Amino acid sequence: TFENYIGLQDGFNEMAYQMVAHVLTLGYAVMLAGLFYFVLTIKTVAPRFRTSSVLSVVVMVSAFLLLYVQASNWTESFVFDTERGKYFLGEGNDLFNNGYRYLNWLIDVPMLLFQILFVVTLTKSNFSSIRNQFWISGTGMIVTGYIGQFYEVTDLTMFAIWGAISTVFFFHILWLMKKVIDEGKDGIPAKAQETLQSIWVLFLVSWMLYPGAYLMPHLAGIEGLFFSEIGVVARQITYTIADVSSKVIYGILLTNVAQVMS
Amino acid sequence: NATFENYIGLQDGFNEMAYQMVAHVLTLGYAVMLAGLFYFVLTIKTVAPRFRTSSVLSVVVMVSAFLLLYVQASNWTESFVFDTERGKYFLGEGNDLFNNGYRYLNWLIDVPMLLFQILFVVTLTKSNFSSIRNQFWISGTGMIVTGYIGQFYEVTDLTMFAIWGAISTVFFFHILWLMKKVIDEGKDGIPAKAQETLQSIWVLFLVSWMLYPGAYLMPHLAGIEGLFFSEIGVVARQITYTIADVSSKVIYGILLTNVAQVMSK
Ligand SMILES: *C/C=C(C)/C=C/C=C(C)/C=C/C1=C(C)CCCC1(C)C
Ligand SMILES: *C/C=C(C)/C=C/C=C(C)/C=C/C1=C(C)CCCC1(C)C
């Protein structure tokens, strides 16, 4: 409950509050933009690759609704105070919770992991085990990382152990994902492999922003510059930077591969 | 292995009346979506800011429903070729009507939005907003996904048709149970006029959403399939789907603004 500590203790200034709102807003705006693209490029690809576009489409709705709800929740959860000149947390149900983002990833991560297996062929690996290990590891990554965030402020020590258990589940993801890229690369045109490598480095970078934002409150030391409203701002841009990269750009690039393969 | 509309269009064919009635009801469909879009943009100012998230969601539902119902109308016109020997329309050139993908893509997109938006209007006393949303999404998505999968076996494998269709009804009965809770809970504490509208919303939700399995699963469940395995059944199902979409999207969103307008006073 990092945002609710800052939101109630220090408060949010007008710039910070309206930035998180605006960033989240264009976040769900580009989600619907990416959805428009994936529907249009469904007959651009062969029937074999149309499962990937649907997975992109399904991912687009869920990210939009998440970014949509979190944008609405952010607008309503913090009420302006006239005497102090800041926005403070207030009472209701349906308050802004960054853990809702986690539960979204619980289902979005496997889809984003699966849909490349529908684009990319597996050589010297069976589709079942790869997909099956993707599922358990990514799910195991998110659930324990979900747990650690509960101790983001009250217990930094549990925040450490739980958040570290998941980052090896992360390292599992990258260790199963690399061969998917590798084995699927050779055999198809080299330009599609170059795309696929860009898809890998993009994969690498964007998926580090999610533990990187998980480390925003305690980056400039435990309670430094980022244990403030700017650390709350910084976290929500980062997520929005990651979400476009991890989903829209990632799916757009998986389609180019599917288009190149006809 | 074959869609109901594909089999009829490839084997039996379509006489002029049936062929033009499907396009007619499809064009009427997106016309109602475009007209509903006018209402929602025009009413966005009639509610307090906290309820414009629901109105804009309706706008989003209208745009995508309009666009996707539009492509279906265009595809229906372009996918069939007239045969002068039979006086009928036959799907040609390996046109599969996209396996009704645009129809199911439309449902895949709109269903979560339709379920999500009522939480932006209605206030909850006992339930966890995030968990309701997650369940809504899981059930709604699985329903349409399993509906699209089983739709390929309606003419071929009755066993596979039943196993996927029965799975879609699991998700469906779960949605009904959820939507009933949200509405019954959101009635507490609000003016009785919005309570009455919320009940009309429930009844409308119940009936309209029921029309989709009615046109797909209930013909086989009652043994009336076979009488509809023709061009008549293709038209009857499309008309039912279109009436259901107007009710579940446009009429649904209108009543939501009426609740938000009462609570915005
Ligand atoms: C569309 C959403 C995406 C791709 C989410 C990705 C999630 C992760 C790579 C983040 C996992 C975490 C860690 C590696 C460290 C501990 C906490 C987490 C869950 C943020
Ligand atoms: C606006 C889009 C809507 C409301 C469409 C929703 C679809 C359903 C409520 C129906 C789903 C189905 C079943 C319950 C059983 C058989 C398979 C379906 C997809 C027709």
Author numbering:
A (entry chain A): 8 to 269
B (entry chain B): 6 to 270
From the paper:
In the dark state, all microbial rhodopsins contain all-trans retinal, which is bound to a specific Lys residue on the seventh helix (G helix) via a protonated Schiff base (PSB). During this photocycle, NaR achieves outward Na+ transport. After starting the photocycle, NaR captures Na+ from CP medium and then releases it to the extracellular (EC) medium.
The crystals were obtained by the lipidic cubic phase (LCP) at pH 5.1 (15). These differences from molecule A seem to be related to the large outward bending of the F' helix caused by unnatural interprotomer interactions. The EC end of this F' helix forms a hydrophobic interaction with the A helix (the first helix) from molecule B of the neighboring asymmetric unit.
